[PDB]
UniProtKB/Swiss-Prot annotation:
Subunit structure: Homodecamer; composed of 5 homodimers. Interacts with LTO1.
Pathway: Amino-acid biosynthesis; L-proline biosynthesis; L-proline from L-glutamate 5-semialdehyde: step 1/1
Enzymatic reactions: L-proline + NADP(+) = (S)-1-pyrroline-5-carboxylate + NADPH + 2 H(+); L-proline + NAD(+) = (S)-1-pyrroline-5-carboxylate + NADH + 2 H(+)
Binding site for L-proline: E166, A239, T240
Pfam families: F420_oxidored (PF03807), P5CR_dimer (PF14748)
Molecular function GO terms recorded: identical protein binding; pyrroline-5-carboxylate reductase activity
Sequence positions that bind NADP(+): 8-13, 36, 58, 71-74, 97-99
UniProt family annotation: Belongs to the pyrroline-5-carboxylate reductase family.
EC number of this enzyme: 1.5.1.2
Record localization: Mitochondrion
Source organism: Homo sapiens (Human)
Name assigned to this protein: Pyrroline-5-carboxylate reductase 1, mitochondrial
Gene name as annotated: PYCR1
Annotated GO CC locations: mitochondrial matrix; mitochondrion
Amino acid sequence: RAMSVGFIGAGQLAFALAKGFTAAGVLAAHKIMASSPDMDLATVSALRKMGVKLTPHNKETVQHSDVLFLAVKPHIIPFILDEIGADIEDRHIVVSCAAGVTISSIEKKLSAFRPAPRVIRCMTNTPVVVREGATVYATGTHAQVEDGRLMEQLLSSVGFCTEVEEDLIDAVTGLSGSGPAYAFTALDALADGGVKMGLPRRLAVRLGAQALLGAAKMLLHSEQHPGQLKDNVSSPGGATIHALHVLESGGFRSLLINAVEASCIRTRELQSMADQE
């Protein structure tokens, strides 16, 4: 409650969480801080207005914060854990969200400054900026169960949360992590196809969006199975099952798996590459 946070990063993710948290009525813009190594107008400059504390020094951060956020590239994360390992008290917990980067790697390199540091691996997506991001996390080794509670609660604030054994997190990042982007492609497309029927741009876009939205909810608030709800929507006649056929005839399902697999697989590499070199 007397808690105040910081992101040593910025960029999207930061602004994502930053924004969702503010709007969540949880923290308070000013009671927050992130470091601008350089300054990316969009992000950085955005925040400026939002009401968040920005410091070039991702060290002033470290202090200002009771809960720390690592929102940096997966290869940059090493060069920081050894720039602040020292400046790391025991009052705060570290939530690293860098893709694929392992607790261990963090811990075991960052502990070279503290007997038992407290860290959690996190996996989230941009839609957090509202309240529908999909978040996952795994508890470190030096992590008490009052930290996995603040985490689990701090995030449900902006979406959906759950504990997951770190290993699953590479897959997860494929689905929920990138998914927001599979979606945006989906729609931009639909909008076009919408428009390629008469519908105007603004219009097609929003209905295509609403179309999706709707589907989600139905699937979440029930089991049903995506399969069966599909059945509930296609009258033996056509118009829908017909659109399906085409999708089904261009490997639509397929090209989504390959996107998950690929997303996943890239994350595997990126980390199992930062392990040696």
